[PDB]
Design a protein around this ligand. Structure first.
Ligand code: PD6
Ligand code: MG
Ligand code: ZN
Length: 323
């Protein structure tokens, strides 16, 4: 217990005080307790607590359970990444003006999904799990293996005694919400983003994009999840550079495991010996994966431009190092 008593007892500072509406937000200076308070504030200011009759103590317990079920020693995919993903979601809904485009249930699902989307991440990739004969890969037939696991864990915590923040929902609202959560968490598989984004970009290019179409709505929610998942790439250079080091640390750690467990030379991305490739890889990733997404999101809501602006600024910085 102990953290629950401290967390539950605390007066939760305002969103303005906590700076969580800012796209350029940094978690680095905050304690674990402070990030927990921020998370309560996100639920509160998105009209989720009273709307769905969440008990304060239960919400606090759930937040702590989510935090606890990240592996703190995994360099990047730990609680702070999940927290930052949820913070970007909050900022996008608020400053980015996405909130009024979505239903209450969608907002509820997205915030829960953001916080839960990498739960119990082992610090290695889907490909690694497949290649090391993971029981998870077998269970999920090699498809979005990690993300199926994150969803499993999400459900487990939601059903845990004392943590049931969705216990107040009606049977139909509960069904709807769980389905959105599943899709949102699965969407964070970059493989699924690459597979599905073409449709999204095409719809926008052809002036066919329609949020009132159920399929296009869920496509948009998947893209929004990815935008938040990759949010560190949009941050002020010092914040982005620090987080980029964590990403590389984790990838190189996998490479070490690959050499030992698979007797293979890792790809550049996973090869510490070839760490000189980082700036060029960062530029390539921003071009291939990031820019089009933040451009598209800004098309949907102009107020999301700061994410695009930040991404472009980071591209310039990396390219200066690379060339
Ligand atoms: C060392 C990274 C090289 C570039 N890179 C290659 C392939 C990837 O799959 C990824 C990735 N998933 N994320 C990032 C990243 C995200 C936020 C902030 C900083 C970086 C980078 C990346
Ligand atoms: Mg993930
Ligand atoms: Zn993630």
């Amino acid at each position: 217990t102990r953290e629950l008593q401290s967390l539950a007892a605390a007066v939760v500072p305002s969103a303005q005080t906590l700076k969580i509406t800012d796209f350029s937000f940094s978690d680095f200076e905050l304690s674990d307790l402070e990030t927990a308070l921020c998370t309560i504030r996100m639920f509160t200011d998105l009209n989720l607590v009273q709307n769905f009759q969440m008990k304060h103590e239960v919400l606090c317990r759930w937040i702590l359970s989510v935090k606890k079920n990240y592996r703190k020693n995994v360099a990047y995919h730990n609680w702070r990444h999940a927290f930052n993903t949820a913070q970007c979601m909050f900022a996008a809904l608020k400053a980015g003006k996405i909130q009024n485009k979505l239903t209450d249930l969608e907002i509820l699902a997205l915030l829960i999904a953001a916080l839960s989307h990498d739960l119990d991440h082992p610090g290695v990739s889907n490909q690694f799990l497949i290649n090391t004969n993971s029981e998870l890969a077998l269970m999920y037939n090699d498809e979005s293996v990690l993300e199926h696991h994150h969803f499993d864990q999400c459900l487990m915590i939601l059903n845990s005694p004392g943590n049931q923040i969705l216990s107040g929902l009606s049977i139909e609202e509960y069904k709807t919400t769980l389905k959105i959560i599943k899709q949102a968490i699965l969407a964070t598989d970059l493989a699924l983003y690459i597979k599905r984004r073409g449709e999204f970009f095409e719809l926008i290019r052809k002036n066919q994009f329609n949020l009132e179409d159920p399929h296009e709505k869920e496509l948009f929610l998947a893209m929004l999840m990815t935008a938040c998942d990759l949010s560190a790439i949009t941050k002020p250079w010092p914040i982005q550079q620090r987080i980029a080091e964590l990403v590389a640390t984790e990838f190189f750690d996998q490479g070490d495991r690959e050499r030992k467990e698979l007797n293979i030379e890792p790809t550049d991305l996973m090869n510490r010996e070839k760490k000189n490739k980082i700036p060029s890889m960062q530029v390539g990733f921003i071009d291939a994966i990031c820019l089009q997404l933040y451009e598209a999101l800004t098309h949907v809501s102009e107020d999301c431009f700061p994410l695009l602006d930040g991404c472009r600024k980071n591209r310039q910085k990396w390219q200066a190092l690379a060339e």
